[PDB]
Symmetry: C2
Subunit: 403 residues, 2 copies
């Protein structure tokens, strides 16, 4: 029998998970239930909430002690993705089914984007608003809504759950993981403010036959890349947005701890580094951000998040940290850095342009990197075709290397 990874929190409405798991089993698959609940642990799940938390580096006690709703969701996203790949590496699944509200669907979307293209993936959403919007697109994720007003406002339809179980079971029984052409797996980090070049890079390498995954470097994406680099078969890492490292260095909101970006280097995966988004630290709401980082220029991204302009002194600490990471690398590394700005905020159309910073940064980064890691300073903005073209050419050389 094929195995389906089933993602569903039991702390709310435990009958949804019970019903859907029974419908999967009745349709002829085995179930591995991953339960990322924070409020209560009901039992009956292969991957318990406690296991989920710890896979991400926190005990559930520590997760429950977070006083920040965003950081708490990030911890369970990080844990769920870590636990799912740690499991799949040893016991491969043939499909992923998720049932959740706004937060649970968002967690499932991120997790599903980190599994291979073509693996069956289905989210059953239970919020009245639209489907979740996974980062940079739905990709191959199938979506169904279970909310109906028939028989009562905001009924959660068991007919949808039954249809979803029968669908995923059908897909899983038809799925042949070791089929089709093998596609080298390329992992990329980005923020919205570096998507222009990241999209060009993605499209070029996919055109070559690679499978490219793109992760949002806002607190959980970088850790997803790091987990894949350690536990799955990755051909190339393009760690182009070190937001989570820079925020770690200065107390920003994307802090994901000190080991961000080290895994690929320790595994010896060919890696390209770039300083996308190094023009800002991510602070909180404007009044808090200004209080935490006085005397700077700010851009209010949304009500919760403020881009805080960096300076040369800030980026020398980033350079030092990246150089130390690279000195631990067990495989090849290249570094590319743009001379005319790091993101769309740091641009002629943005609110944080400061052209005095890229030059000194590039010169210092080259001085601290070891001799076997060349730094290429590109006379372009990050989002210029000249910069994506330079990264693409380098990626293609690293992917052409023979065993």
């Amino acid at each position: 029998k094929p195995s389906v990874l089933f993602i569903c929190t039991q702390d709310t409405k435990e009958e949804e998970a019970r019903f859907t798991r029974a419908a999967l089993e009745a349709a002829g698959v085995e179930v591995v239930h991953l339960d990322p609940s924070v409020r209560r642990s009901l039992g009956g799940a292969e991957i318990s909430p406690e296991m989920v938390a710890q896979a991400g580096g926190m005990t559930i006690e520590e997760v429950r002690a977070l006083g920040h709703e965003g950081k708490c969701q990030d911890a369970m996203i990080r844990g769920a993705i870590a636990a799912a790949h740690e499991w799949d590496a040893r016991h491969p699944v043939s499909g992923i089914l998720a049932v959740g509200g706004s937060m649970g669907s968002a967690l499932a979307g991120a997790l599903m984007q980190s599994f291979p293209y073509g693996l069956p993936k289905l989210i059953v959403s239970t919020m009245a608003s639209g489907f979740t919007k996974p980062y940079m697109g739905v990709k191959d994720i199938a979506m169904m809504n279970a909310v109906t007003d028939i028989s009562g406002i905001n009924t959660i339809s068991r007919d949808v759950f039954r249809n979803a179980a029968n669908a995923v079971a059908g897909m899983a029984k038809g799925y042949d993981r070791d089929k089709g052409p093998e596609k080298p797996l390329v992992l990329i980090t980005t923020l919205g403010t570096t998507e222009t070049s990241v999209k060009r890079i993605r499209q070029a390498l996919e055109s070559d036959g690679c499978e490219v995954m793109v992760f949002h470097s806002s607190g959980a994406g970088g850790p997803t890349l790091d987990g894949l680099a350690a536990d799955k078969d990755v051909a190339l890492v393009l760690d182009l947005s070190p937001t989570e490292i820079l925020d770690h260095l200065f107390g920003g909101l994307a802090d994901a701890g000190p080991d961000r970006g080290r895994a690929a280097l320790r595994k010896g995966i060919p890696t390209i580094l770039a300083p996308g988004n190094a023009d800002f630290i991510i602070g909180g709401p404007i009044d808090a951000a200004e209080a935490q980082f006085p005397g700077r220029r700010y851009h209010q991204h949304n009500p919760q998040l403020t881009a805080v302009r960096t300076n040369v002194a800030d980026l020398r600490k980033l350079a030092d940290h990246l150089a130390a990471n690279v000195r631990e690398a067990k495989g090849p590394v290249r570094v590319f850095t743009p001379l005319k700005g790091f993101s769309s905020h740091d641009s002629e159309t943005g609110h944080l342009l400061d052209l005095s910073v890229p030059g000194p940064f590039a010169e210092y980064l080259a001085s601290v990197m070891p001799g076997h890691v060349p730094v290429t300073a590109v006379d372009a903005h990050f989002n210029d075709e000249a910069f994506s073209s330079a990264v693409i050419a380098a990626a293609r050389e690293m992917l052409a290397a023979k065993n």
Copy 2:
């Protein structure tokens, strides 16, 4: 074996269509391929493009010569829906799978919205924008997207098509159309400018246990309601937006011919009429709309569509036509009309407001409707809670009768 209705244009996706059909067959279903192609008519489709066109009342050559995105789409939607329900009438399907771009996905969505809640439904879209947006919400339609750039930009993936076929076959093999309680079926017409009250009406009757289908009355929706009313077990029709009748009278863009709105009445289904959106005729872009409909007032709804303000005389013609239709009714009919405006364009925060029209229109409408059909003039706007509540109360009485 159960059957799956498979919607896919072969004139642009022939390889994908044959692959996906084969995958459905391998997974143990029979396939009914409905092919709404507009360029070519390739072999193997149960419901050919020619049938899609003619089931709606046009030859495929006539559809091709429209040259016009909206008129072509409306023709193929009307035809695809008529042909699909005609097939299903005698040979019932157990699921619907569609594979298409922007237009094919939208046609599939409209067709799926005219089939019962819970019947397996999956749209695989092939446009880069992602999923299509079915009118007033996805409800029970499942969505996938097959675009990928791997091995070539704007590829569409065999892995996704195979997953989609396996999914719908699995759902169809597990589907029991007789499971659960019967839901009384209620059909409603609307435009975006009457959605505020229609949403309340839908929610109240769904919460009573009804299945409610809602149709956009822009050229294909009304005809879908009429087809269902003629041929299916319908508990109640709320024909609250006679746009397609008004545009037939004046040559507007939602014209769907002379029989719009008659089927439910001729059959005898309990029906409520209202004059939602009677503040405007639908014209084309503003310059052409002014030339077609001179001497009026206009509101540019989007670059393609202009709302052309109606006047007293126009609405007396509409009332005459509605009354003629009602005199043919074989079952209960009631009428509700709002005294403070017919749509969100005809409101204090709308660009077509004319509060001098609803009062005299309501008087005239009552005078030409037969006396056994009540005509209630509500001292509210169409989209006010008082108006939806009046319609809901009458709907409940008519369902209980």
